[PDB]
C-alpha cells in the first residue's frame, strides 16, 4: 500500500551514514606481479 507512515524502528543516524559511506572502499589494488625470467628484465 506504500503508505505505512509509521516511524521506522531504526532511524538513520549520522555515524551510520559515514560507516556505510566508508564501506564503499575496498582493499588496495592487486596488480599481477612482474616476472623476471632473465637478466634483461632484471637490469
Amino acid at each position: 500500500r506504500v503508505k505505512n507512515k509509521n516511524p521506522a524502528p531504526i532511524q538513520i543516524s549520522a555515524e551510520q551514514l559515514l560507516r556505510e559511506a566508508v564501506e564503499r572502499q575496498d582493499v588496495a589494488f592487486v596488480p599481477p606481479k612482474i616476472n623476471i625470467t632473465d637478466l634483461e628484465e632484471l637490469q
Binding site: 606481479k33 616476472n35 623476471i36 625470467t37 632473465d38 637478466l39 632484471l42
Partner: peptide
C-alpha cells in the same frame, strides 16, 4: 650472481605457481 639467479628462480616458480595455485 646468486641474487640474480635466486630472483630468476623465484620468478619462475611463481609463474608456474599461477598454474600450481590456480584452483587451490
Amino acid at each position: 650472481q646468486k641474487i640474480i639467479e635466486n630472483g630468476i628462480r623465484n620468478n619462475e616458480m611463481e609463474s608456474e605457481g599461477r598454474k600450481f595455485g590456480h584452483f587451490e
